[PDB]
């Protein structure tokens, strides 16, 4: 359940 700013990582 992550937020989209954290997707790339």
């Amino acid at each position, epitope marked *: *359940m992550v*937020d*989209s*700013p954290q*997707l*790339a990582t």
Partner: antibody
Amino acid sequence: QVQLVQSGAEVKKPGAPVKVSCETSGYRFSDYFVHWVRQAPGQGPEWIGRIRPNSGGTKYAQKFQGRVTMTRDMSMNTAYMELSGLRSDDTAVYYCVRGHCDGTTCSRAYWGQGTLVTVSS
Amino acid sequence: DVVMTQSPLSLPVTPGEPASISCRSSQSLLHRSGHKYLHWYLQRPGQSPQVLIYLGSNRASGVPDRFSGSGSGTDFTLKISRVEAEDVGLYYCMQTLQTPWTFGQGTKVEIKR
């Protein structure tokens, strides 16, 4: 163009549920979170929750946990939000909102036109 | 939740004069990737929020050049260089660094006469 098209205005009695649909075009549906926001009259906007179309995973705000169900139909590029137990304070314009980030890049949001839901007997 | 504080609440502007709207976040919206997750939108009656400025400073397509946005990670400014009748309405800042998405209090821009 990126487009999000919502279903029509709803009038519902207290306690009834509402199911709003949000059909999308102009981008790959699977690649962006779909968020739901409302704004009641005499209130600031309010984030309801989101769905991740690839997994179907959902995240809801505390206040709508247990009363909202978000889903999507990949084949139709459409997201849905069902809000149950409607009260007068749920009278609001409801928006679906394409996210900003696809995994690789981050951009602007795109908003649907809004769906007015009026709670009244 | 991230708390957004917006000022002023009411902004009457004489035609042709500029307007500035401030927004501050309770924590930095500058992500370590370099993106600033702060956006500005205009709300007019009976229609969707219109994105003005996204990711801190990018102007959306079709938005007049008289709109611009800047800021640090915590303090942001929407600038309108001249204010027309077309610009009258309710302006909000919003953060999307984290969910829930949160919104400033809103500024009511009107024409001063």
